[PDB]
Design an enzyme around this catalytic site. Structure first.
Site, PDB file in Angstrom:
ATOM      1  N   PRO A 166       0.806  -1.222   0.000  1.00 49.59           N
ATOM      2  CA  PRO A 166       0.000   0.000   0.000  1.00 49.59           C
ATOM      3  C   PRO A 166       0.843   1.278   0.000  1.00 49.59           C
ATOM      4  O   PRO A 166       1.961   1.280   0.513  1.00 49.59           O
ATOM      5  CB  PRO A 166      -0.804  -0.098   1.306  1.00 49.59           C
ATOM      6  N   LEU A 167       0.305   2.351  -0.581  1.00 50.02           N
ATOM      7  CA  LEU A 167       0.948   3.665  -0.528  1.00 50.02           C
ATOM      8  C   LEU A 167       0.249   4.544   0.500  1.00 50.02           C
ATOM      9  O   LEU A 167      -0.943   4.835   0.378  1.00 50.02           O
ATOM     10  CB  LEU A 167       0.956   4.346  -1.902  1.00 50.02           C
ATOM     11  N   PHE A 198      -3.693   4.063   0.244  1.00 48.34           N
ATOM     12  CA  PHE A 198      -3.992   3.586  -1.103  1.00 48.34           C
ATOM     13  C   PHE A 198      -3.581   2.129  -1.157  1.00 48.34           C
ATOM     14  O   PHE A 198      -2.414   1.787  -1.123  1.00 48.34           O
ATOM     15  CB  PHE A 198      -3.249   4.374  -2.172  1.00 48.34           C
TER      16      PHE A 198
END
Lengths: 129, 129, 129
Positions: free
Chosen positions: C1-2, C71
């Site tokens: 994930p970001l 994200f």
């Protein structure tokens, strides 16, 4: 909704705040979202760090571009979104942002993708409508 | 599309723009997007503010990480997305961003989620194909 | 994930690193993600360039607000996301982040929407599972 407003650093701070007010007043107007449903991150860059050309539509922008990225629940209609784009742009004109210098985008998630505080997901629990 | 490029302070303003020019050349040559369809936010950080590891893949990055975040409408195939990552990284190698130091993410919306100016949704009004 | 962590400049850098370690540890815990799957962008703002109210839920925050934007690829459950929210916040509590000062958003994409380095789409090629 979470709003990221990215703008240039020639603008004053009074005006950055007024742009943030306008974007928010407009979302309350069309979305009928609660008045304290307000979450915004204002970021100011050197003019050179934001590039927003015309997409070949045949206009020019000033270097003082305001980019507005709306992260919001899926559900809103195409015309509601069209009303959001209009209300924001007209809310910003009297405040010093020319309609050529406004870029808006929406990206969507669901009610279960939000936590407003306290480790809680208020839409899932029903605390928020 | 809208591109958030996040990178580090150690890179000169000239390299920052070269970077952005390369991310945009890549996107024009693989997506066949209009050349003037250019919407970018460049944010430079202290190197310590960007933390990008190797996902367990056994490689080293420099402190000079370049996170590129693509916000674009749905439509593109897996394969076209691979070609995008390839072209972005290849565009950037000759400017002096190593392949180890580039991180790319894609986030999708609809054409009705875009206003390029004047309060209008040009994909909805058909002012844009 | 970001992960994008947007917080306030008044926080001390050590604390900024601690807030980021704790978001990272929290996601490893609930999501059983690889520990070296750590991709985060911290952005410090002047306090008033973050606006975060209460959605009318009836609570106040300090100005030391910390907005986290995850994200992540689609596929986590409603319940898993709640465990995410709850764990991020509890981890952040001993590090001088009040429950009232946290805000979290998740936005979803697909595994083919990621490049971890080298111009490659690791989930698509199978270098990562």
């Amino acid at each position: 909704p979470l709003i990221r407003i990215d703008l240039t650093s020639d603008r004053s701070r009074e005006q950055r705040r007024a742009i943030a007010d306008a974007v928010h007043d407009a979302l309350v107007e069309v979305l009928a979202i609660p008045a304290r449903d307000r979450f915004q991150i204002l970021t100011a860059h050197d003019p050179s760090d934001i590039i927003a050309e015309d997409a070949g539509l045949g206009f020019q922008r000033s270097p003082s571009v305001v980019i507005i990225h709306v992260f919001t629940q899926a559900g809103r209609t195409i015309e509601t979104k069209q009303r959001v784009f209009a209300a924001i742009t007209e809310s910003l004109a009297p405040i010093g942002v020319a309609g050529s210098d406004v870029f808006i985008a929406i990206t969507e998630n669901a009610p279960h993708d939000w936590s407003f505080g306290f480790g809680s997901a208020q839409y899932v629990t029903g605390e928020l409508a």
